[PDB]
Design a protein around this motif. Sequence first.
Motif, PDB file in Angstrom:
ATOM      1  N   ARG A  19     -19.737 -20.522  42.411  1.00 12.95           N
ATOM      2  CA  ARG A  19     -20.796 -19.614  41.964  1.00 12.95           C
ATOM      3  C   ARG A  19     -20.607 -18.207  42.534  1.00 12.95           C
ATOM      4  NH1 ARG A  19     -23.423 -17.709  37.959  1.00 12.95           N
ATOM      5  NH2 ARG A  19     -25.707 -17.657  38.190  1.00 12.95           N
ATOM      6  N   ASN A  21     -30.622 -16.517  38.523  1.00 10.14           N
ATOM      7  CA  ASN A  21     -30.052 -16.809  37.220  1.00 10.14           C
ATOM      8  C   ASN A  21     -29.846 -18.307  37.033  1.00 10.14           C
ATOM      9  OD1 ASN A  21     -27.311 -17.497  35.688  1.00 10.14           O
ATOM     10  ND2 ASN A  21     -28.424 -15.867  34.578  1.00 10.14           N
ATOM     11  N   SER A  26     -31.560 -19.774  33.804  1.00 10.88           N
ATOM     12  CA  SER A  26     -30.626 -20.036  32.717  1.00 10.88           C
ATOM     13  C   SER A  26     -30.233 -21.501  32.657  1.00 10.88           C
ATOM     14  CB  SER A  26     -29.382 -19.145  32.872  1.00 10.88           C
ATOM     15  OG  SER A  26     -28.576 -19.570  33.967  1.00 10.88           O
ATOM     16  N   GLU A  40     -28.274 -23.300  29.489  1.00 12.88           N
ATOM     17  CA  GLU A  40     -26.969 -23.865  29.824  1.00 12.88           C
ATOM     18  C   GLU A  40     -26.952 -25.393  29.668  1.00 12.88           C
ATOM     19  OE1 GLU A  40     -26.201 -22.236  33.787  1.00 12.88           O
ATOM     20  OE2 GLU A  40     -25.948 -20.211  32.885  1.00 12.88           O
TER      21      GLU A  40
HETATM   22 MG   LIG Z   1     -26.455 -18.789  34.248  1.00 14.59          MG
END
Ligand SMILES: [Mg+2]
Lengths: 305, 305, 304, 305
Positions: free
Chosen positions: B175, B218, B222, B226
């Motif tokens: 990440r 995020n 997200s 995702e």
């Molecule tokens: Mg993301």
Amino acid sequence: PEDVRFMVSLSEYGAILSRFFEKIDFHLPKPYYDSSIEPALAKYIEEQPWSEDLKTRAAKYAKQAVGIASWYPRASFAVRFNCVVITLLVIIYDEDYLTFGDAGTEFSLRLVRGLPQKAPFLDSLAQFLQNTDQYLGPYGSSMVIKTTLEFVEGTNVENDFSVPPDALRFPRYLRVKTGFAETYAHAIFPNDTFPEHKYRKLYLPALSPLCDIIDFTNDILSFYKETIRGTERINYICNVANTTGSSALRCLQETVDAVESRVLEIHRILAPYPDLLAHCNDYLAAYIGYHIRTTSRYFLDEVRF
Amino acid sequence: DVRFMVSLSEYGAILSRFFEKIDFHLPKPYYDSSIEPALAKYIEEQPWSEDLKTRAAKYAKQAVGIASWYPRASFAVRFNCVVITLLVIIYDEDYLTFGDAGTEFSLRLVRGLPQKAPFLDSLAQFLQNTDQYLGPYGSSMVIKTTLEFVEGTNVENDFSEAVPPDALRFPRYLRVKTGFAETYAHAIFPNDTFPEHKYRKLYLPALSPLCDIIDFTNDILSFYKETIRGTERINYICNVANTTGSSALRCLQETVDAVESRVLEIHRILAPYPDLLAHCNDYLAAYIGYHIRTTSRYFLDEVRF
Amino acid sequence: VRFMVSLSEYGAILSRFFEKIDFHLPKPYYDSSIEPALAKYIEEQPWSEDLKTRAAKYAKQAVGIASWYPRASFAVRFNCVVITLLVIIYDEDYLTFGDAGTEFSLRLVRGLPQKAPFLDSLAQFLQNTDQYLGPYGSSMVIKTTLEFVEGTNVENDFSEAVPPDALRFPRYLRVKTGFAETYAHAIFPNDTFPEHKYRKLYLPALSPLCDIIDFTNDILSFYKETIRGTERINYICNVANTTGSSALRCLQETVDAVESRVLEIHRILAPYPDLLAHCNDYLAAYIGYHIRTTSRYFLDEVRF
Amino acid sequence: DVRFMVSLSEYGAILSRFFEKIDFHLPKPYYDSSIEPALAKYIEEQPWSEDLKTRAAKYAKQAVGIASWYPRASFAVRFNCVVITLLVIIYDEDYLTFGDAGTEFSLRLVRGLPQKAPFLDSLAQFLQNTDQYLGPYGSSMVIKTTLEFVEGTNVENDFSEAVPPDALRFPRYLRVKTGFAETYAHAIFPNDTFPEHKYRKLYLPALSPLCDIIDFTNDILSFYKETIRGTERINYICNVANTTGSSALRCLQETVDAVESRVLEIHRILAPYPDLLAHCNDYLAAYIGYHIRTTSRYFLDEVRF
Ligand SMILES: [Mg+2]
Ligand SMILES: [Mg+2]
Ligand SMILES: [Mg+2]
Ligand SMILES: [Mg+2]
Ligand SMILES: [Mg+2]
Ligand SMILES: [Mg+2]
Ligand SMILES: [Mg+2]
Ligand SMILES: [Mg+2]
């Protein structure tokens, strides 16, 4: 009185190291000798378009750089020698970044602009980064470049914190930026032995724990020369003690436990891959042995472990 | 498998609790009439194919919202952040279409060579001119973060079903490589308002928790597009679930808790410095708000919170 | 007469005072860097050579202030030594500057040159306290210096002029002349104790600390001011003149007041052991400084 | 919490008893037709935002009544006291709106630097010009009191929940720092009427009780708008109740008794000097009257006394 929090008694520090070596089953390697690295590094230095003064000083810096070859006992000459060369160049940086005034302050921009650097040894550093494909695949090359950028600028910024109590994540961040660990970690898995297209997906999960092992193991083993015997108060262990309000001793012990946990994680991750694991185990034993045997830097003959 | 499978209702309830805990309030809409015309001019000036320009006009609709993250910043800062956002959106969205050009990026960059694709020339030129809006440490960090992003994007899908069960440190490592966080975090503290020589020592302890906030917020916001709505199983939350043998539901909650802890840490660190703190708070409010408002990317109008 | 205090009476008061607060003289404090740094500071000021020459004598008294802050950085210790030198020069030689002191505050806020170079040095010090203090401490050093310059200028207006019914006036004048907040804020330096996190913890101790600083000097300097010397407008005499009491009674009452404040500080800072440790180091060295600085307080002439 | 509860009946009775014990009579209404136009002109002349000028129209109506505190003083005395009242009302009611500006007021003032906000430039200019109505000692005290007020205001939020019960002297310390009393007390004895060289030694023994009267009389008369009608629990009365284990009712009465005692002390100290004493008597009657008449701030027309 104000320094008690950062001191550790010699007997207790020796006991920390004995417990550390027991927990990771450290066994000292036999003494490394490579009669090839020193002549090659001397020839490298002679070939650089450097001043006579820099070449003269680089002789002393080279004496300490060459020990890095002992960290990769089975690797090709190309891997050992390049690791030694970049170590020489970042030792010179660590020595001259203030003298060169603002030289390294423009390294990264001039590097990506293809412009001559403000000092010839920074041109040598640029050329090294330009030729990492001699011994690494493209992911490894990219990370050696980005790690060198972090080191040049983090070294500059380090000189500003001679540390806020509430900044718990900062000590590790500073240590990542200035420890240079990713450069050495990638040479644990050289591109000739472990070509990236086949092996990178197998060893990538070990890179983060290796980088922690490299940083933290040096923090444990150089705490004597930095802080007990030295005047250093802004290293990782002291920074952790400052932000947590703890003692240096308790932070050293937490760092020992962290290294053991990284070692176990690597042993698990690379269990299916005996050659990748053997390169990791070989590195760690050689790395620790280097700290023990190099008494002009780490003075560990003075501690009982 | 059951490990994944977070319900719409569960996810909405977690987001509701997250926003309540951090006292999130949606900022009023941000509009600077100069941003889109400037970005259209930038696109038209690039030596890109006509189809890449049309597609980039599509991506631009998402990129222009980044200006709202830096509402008190100069136009140069807002516009440059928008431009680099457009470029990394193009790279991600179309890195199949560039072939092997990305794998050569870092070496061509440091050799001062043109890139294999003109789009990557635009990226190289951006990196060469980061000093137009950041100081020397920030410019280096944007360069090095872009090298990591290009290489992390290239390797990301190698791990499709290949994340080792006990690789605890790997999810965070991946990440860091793919999230691009340092680029945005440094523009929170632009060099014109907060010149590095005076302010870097003040805000640097905040950068690491800020990068965690950027990455992890995020990941929280997200996760719907995702993994619940999409097929992504190689993102941070899924990687944590697979390396810990735990459920995506629990790991999502753990990431919310981490972000909440980081927000408290930033508020403590920057308390003595109201201007720095205000830039940080503006950033956080607008970053979350951007996730909610950009329904074409995150589809959060489909979740109840 | 009402102001007569014998050597024996005074020494006995000091003995009981030290016993009651459990005072023990710290081991001698020495930092080899302080004296040459202050000498270089003096050499760099654009003072007359006569004032620099004089100032060597006052420097010998100022350097001991570093021992008040033994766990603090060199920046804290040295800046406290510098401001001490400046206020000693003012405390002893303010009449040699004519009416310069009377215009100090307005010239400072206007950005005007001071009437004497020495006061330019004082203004420059106030402009650089962010080297060792946070914003609250910096403001307090400025406001305390303005009070000190003016309290010093007006102190002697009250010789044989302190009115009997003004029971709060002696304390008011002592706040102005004592300069206490400057030293008290350095007990909690901004690098060890960043203000935003620690000021809520130590500000509740500032008022009793300033009382201890002012009054402990009143107790320990009573010999050089009033027994050995001719000062009759100090705090103790002012209290005696407003209360009709003997100087001895007022001295005893001031001792009792300090003992009570010491208990108060220990109660307030007990939950914060590092703040408390800096406080205790300060008090022991503050008293010790009065005993050892025989050239200023002459306490080797007293049996205690 | 019952400890802070004071009924409207009880509060009105406290005020009635207080007024009868000091022989208070609401002064005949004071008016100088020059004051309001002069303050409007002052506001119009400042380089402030139109928004700030609009807000200052509201604050000016509370500030102009200050001229009635000095009914026998020159226009220079009355107008300057009105101006500095306007400025400290703006600072207090609205230092939400200025951010960190006040935190660097004191250093910027003594360094001769522009302030971070035009409003604070106006405050600095006022401090530079107090020789228009005060002698040197009074000018010094206005400067030092303003520095205390600015910093005490900046830290007042540290104890927004409650002050430490263990610190008995801290409520008075806090009230001294934020009450601004010395600035108003010195204008009771203007330098044009009472030149410091002859008069300072006569009225300085009264300044300490006068400062107590100013602080405590506002505490008494603003208790309704702060704590009965409002929600304040960290003002002087409540803080004393918290530190002494008493009730707000008992601490209110004890503050009334303290004021009555100071009034008698002042009458004794200044008995030999009738013009000095007269200025004090005029001040106190108009100070109390201002609290009664400024119903938009203290709401005392909602109280029966
Ligand atoms: Mg993301
Ligand atoms: Mg080390
Ligand atoms: Mg080192
Ligand atoms: Mg994505
Ligand atoms: Mg004296
Ligand atoms: Mg004295
Ligand atoms: Mg108020
Ligand atoms: Mg009030």
